[model samples]
Target: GSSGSSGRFTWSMKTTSSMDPSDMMREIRKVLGANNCDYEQRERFLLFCVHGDGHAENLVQWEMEVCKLPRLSLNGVRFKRISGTSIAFKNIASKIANELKL
Candidate 1:
């Protein structure tokens, strides 16, 4: 099991366990900086929540796309803050295809 998305720009997944949790945090911070956004993280046990602007979604999205993450793999996870907005990401799956590229 590896990855998938739902609703709008949303991702539901886990990371590869070969890497440490700190590594995942570092990559996310790197993504935030590139997007010119601030960051905040809340975590415990196996849950991790992230806070930021709209770009917050991208931080996780990019990691799923580029970093060694898996929906059931479990190196780590990045969850988005819940909002009352119309679109909501309801989470987890694997077998995410790489898809065709032009």
Candidate 2:
């Protein structure tokens, strides 16, 4: 969560259950190389969002777009950032208040 000084945020997700750590690491290399990820390591889930000036300036858009993928590994396997926030994404949120017909 490098929201302030670095202007960049790093994210890695470890599946809560039903997955092997080492197995994941083995394949994670390709993802890192594809993005030319800066200062990355043998991690999990997915890789950094390579956009938005590396910070919140335009992160929302980047996040939204990248989220287009339901899962990173593409095997229907679920994963989460076991180290960081336990909180995860729910569903697409909308401006319910403004669209109300009240």
Candidate 3:
């Protein structure tokens, strides 16, 4: 999720059914590296949603974990109900591409 310049990354997902927030958070932590997160910075960040159960829970878990980081900040997490199951991650495509060095 990070843009490579500031170690910032964002992850978003849309599912047909409600998912376990803890599970998602665990996965994120694993990928992002626990030590790389800045809980305070992450708390100020926002997470978007589109009509689903467990969405709030997901945000809460994300915030909690982010709060543990010293360098990261959590802005805020928000969500809106959409029609279909489509998750979009903004501003991180280049980072992902770069990971593969494509």
By descending lDDT, how would the candidates be arranged? Answer: 1, 3, 2
Q: On residues 8-102, what C-alpha lDDT tens digit does candidate 3 reach at each position?
A: 33443322113334344444434334323222233333232221222433321222221222333322112222223223222232222232111
Model 3 off-target regions past 4 Å?
1-17, 34-89, 93-102
- Give the alpha carbon lDDT tens digit for every residue of 34-54 in model 1: 544444453332223232334
TM-scores for every predicted model: 0.37, 0.25, 0.23
RMSD (CA, Å), candidate 2 to true, equals: 14.3
Q: Model-by-model lDDT, in order?
A: 0.38, 0.29, 0.29
Best-to-worst ranking by TM-score: 1, 2, 3
Model 1, which residues run further than 4 Å from truth?
Answer: 1-11, 14-17, 41-73, 84-102
Worst 10 residues of 2 by lDDT: 91-100
TM-score of 3: 0.23
lDDT of 1 at 70: 44
Better of 1 and 2 by lDDT: 1
Q: Which of candidates 1 and 3 reaches a greater lDDT?
A: 1
